[PDB]
Symmetry: C2
Subunit: 569 residues, 2 copies
Amino acid sequence: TFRRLWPTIAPFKAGLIVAGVALILNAASDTFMLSLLKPLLDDGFGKTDRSVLVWMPLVVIGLMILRGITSYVSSYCISWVSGKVVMTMRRRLFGHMMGMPVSFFDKQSTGTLLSRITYDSEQVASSSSGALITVVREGASIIGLFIMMFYYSWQLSIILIVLAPIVSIAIRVVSKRFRNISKNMQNTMGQVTTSAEQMLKGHKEVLIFGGQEVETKRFDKVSNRMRLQGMKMVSASSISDPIIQLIASLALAFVLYAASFPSVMDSLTAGTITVVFSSMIALMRPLKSLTNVNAQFQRGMAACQTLFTILDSEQEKDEGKRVIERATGDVEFRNVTFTYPGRDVPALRNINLKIPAGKTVALVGRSGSGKSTIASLITRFYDIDEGEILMDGHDLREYTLASLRNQVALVSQNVHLFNDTVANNIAYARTEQYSREQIEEAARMAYAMDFINKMDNGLDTVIGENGVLLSGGQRQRIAIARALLRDSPILILDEATSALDTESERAIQAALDELQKNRTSLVIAHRLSTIEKADEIVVVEDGVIVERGTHNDLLEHRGVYAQLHKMQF
Amino acid sequence: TFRRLWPTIAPFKAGLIVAGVALILNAASDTFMLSLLKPLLDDGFGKTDRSVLVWMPLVVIGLMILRGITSYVSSYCISWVSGKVVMTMRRRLFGHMMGMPVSFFDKQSTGTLLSRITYDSEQVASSSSGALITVVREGASIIGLFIMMFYYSWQLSIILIVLAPIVSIAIRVVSKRFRNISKNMQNTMGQVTTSAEQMLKGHKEVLIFGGQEVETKRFDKVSNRMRLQGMKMVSASSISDPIIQLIASLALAFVLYAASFPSVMDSLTAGTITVVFSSMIALMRPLKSLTNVNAQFQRGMAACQTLFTILDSEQEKDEGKRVIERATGDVEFRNVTFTYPGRDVPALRNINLKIPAGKTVALVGRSGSGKSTIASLITRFYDIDEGEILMDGHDLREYTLASLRNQVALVSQNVHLFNDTVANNIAYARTEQYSREQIEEAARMAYAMDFINKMDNGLDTVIGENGVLLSGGQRQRIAIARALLRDSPILILDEATSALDTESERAIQAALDELQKNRTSLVIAHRLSTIEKADEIVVVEDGVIVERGTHNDLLEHRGVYAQLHKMQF
């Protein structure tokens, strides 16, 4: 049907072929165990002979050691298949989501994708394993038991097998029809209960107008209708079982009536009747398990199709082929507008903004909607529809994905730290290029010994996942340390602390150093340090500009800059 | 534990006995059916003689009649017990539900209370029925199958039942310990998958720094770790199975080792071993059902105790016994700043305003003041905390709730009509002394001849519960429906909604003139159309007392009355 899981089992296709011995043997041992009962009937207890009985219990012990070893190794084999194939699937999808655009796990909706990977992937694995072991073991069981039945009495065989479908269809249709009879009037029972609900929910009017006796009488009547409904519920539910069991018993009656009614029949050992009846008693469980194998297979395959439509989605397409060394050109935001999923409003209206190199330009806003997307989206995450971000004679899309992300670093209160040494966390990706000496120099500039480097280790200690939980401001500090190590050309910072400025007031922007004098940067306005340190503030609120003058010129009069100043004190 | 069901079972206690007498036979049917095996094998074809093989199918049918008929009868009897005991439980709980205070509906329980009285009633019924079948059918099927030893095993199968508890304790302890072994690594599985959580939640950061390949390597290692963890996971459950199968195999081996001594085996023939083994096969299901009977006994019966809490929850108590035929007196409020139970919200006004009977007055409010709650204090749906509301020289609590029920009326958009005809709907309970003549003269100045009350079954048109869907504005009022028959002195006019109903808005003012000739009644002015026909404009609004103002003093300046005019219009 959907055989895309067949290539990925190719490197491990030999698992099932190796398991084949176990797949046949699991059922072969039980079938043979049932076969050995015939000697226990006649060759054993049926006569004074007990030569077989000398060792038969040793045979059943030994054959189930074979059964247990086959079960253990079959489980080990499907484990080796399942863990390896889900490992490869995880490898592929991990590389895919890091290749995916702004979508389900980026800005669209919750991060329940890991729930999908952690639950439904192993659900698919367990489903495939259960389906394979079930189909193979039960097929072997049916074939072995049919072999035994033919080998013992072919006439009794065929008469029992032709008896089987009649009872099967009888029980199936009577169960279905009586279930329908139950439901089509269970709905009426639900209707009566929901009618009683309104009587209950009308407690106000009865409590004021006064209807205790009459309302109780009404409920008594409706409850009596419910009582008759319950009577008929139990009658319908309890009349299916007697008919079902009646047909089940009549199967035994039919086979025994056919048994020995001709003189030629019952020419058998006369003990084999017991073992074939025991085989019928035994096979019911595997038969009931054999009904839902195709539905389970296709449900698991539907889950796999969910994981596969997660797979083979379009990745970050970037056809630009302008390799980047260092972009000193200006960043232009001229009447640009990108797209935001789930928002019919245009994500960014016409905006005019230029940030020459070495100029500290600070943007200000109040609502916040649009504040992040103006400066945090110069990395070309969201698709820009019309307008151009000029980058040294080339647009944003014309530059290949290289340097930092394309050209720019970022810092915010959401910087998720990885479990590699914090030194390599700040030398992430480009670990080989930068030595450890310049890494500890970057830490020297970070100037945070009391938090990160105080002989917890030299520098090799890591902030463990949900472990140490070092401070958010401090993780911002080592993030900008990472940025200065990688020599960030342009920098984005959110400044979402609004809390105690314990030593971060010194290193509010990379210790107020070459990252500010050179390497122009944007600041989201939350602190007056950013306000007083600005070259030409572009006032932006709700995706539009209201002022574009010099901050100090806007400070003399009110305008709009002074208003946002008023509240931001 | 809680023997409160037994008093109600007492008027139908014979039902359970007549169910059990049938279920004992039903259980014994299977035991006797198994007992027929010894005649079948050795007395029958084992000796190679006709014997009574022509009877055994007929015996099967003749015992399954006593299976099926008694199954149906026992089901009918337990249904008789259940459908009556639940009926009286629902009657009693309804009696002690609408008769207890109103705060339970208000935020203490949502609409799921139907499931508290509907679905849990069936839950207690189903659990009682389950306990009855599982103590009588199982519990007498067990004794029926247990007596096979006395009929057969004088010395032959006592070793089997001595062996059984060893099997039970061994399989239980090994299963529990291996369950613990399997479960004490799910924490590590969660640890590694949460590390993966952090990894893919850092997709923003790694996309800034483009380290997708080194991240993929990190995930390669962690994914291999959890792959080995899954290997050990499934290995634990795999190696659980042969250990528990070993106990059954050694049980069979021990049985046959005991059978290796002919000095006891001289007197079994051949089929008795078969019937003993069949009894073992039939013994698996009833014990597995018997394990959970003590839990199932207190599964829903604990829920029955939960319902008993509502049953014995106190009703609205009113020790006052002051009755009144027609309360032509003032209702005087004094410093009532009550807070309704369940939440300490900002309170209402320190009310000191008196409404006199024979001196009409209308109340105007604004912005969810809880002024509707003030109306409840005329009806005492809610409790009064401080202050006092007095009625004709007597306090609120001094009167019987029936008396104020008769005196006070209410008008609102939300009135839960009932499953009856409209004529008795307007005569909800007090209909015996009010015949159809006083229905139709009320209809005469109802002026609702056909607006929504069109002649379908005459003026006493049959009202369908939740199906008629009539307009709430003209569903309930003194002439439109009721309170004219009771000639209610005090009445509420909610005036919640203001739609463009045709002439029904005029009909509201018509009913206003037909009412306010006498029977002074305040209103809640969602719209300010009724304040024109108001002798005094009491201007208290919001959560505090503002003043007791008249029509003229507040009109000259902004104040509140003219303000509420400005915002509304």
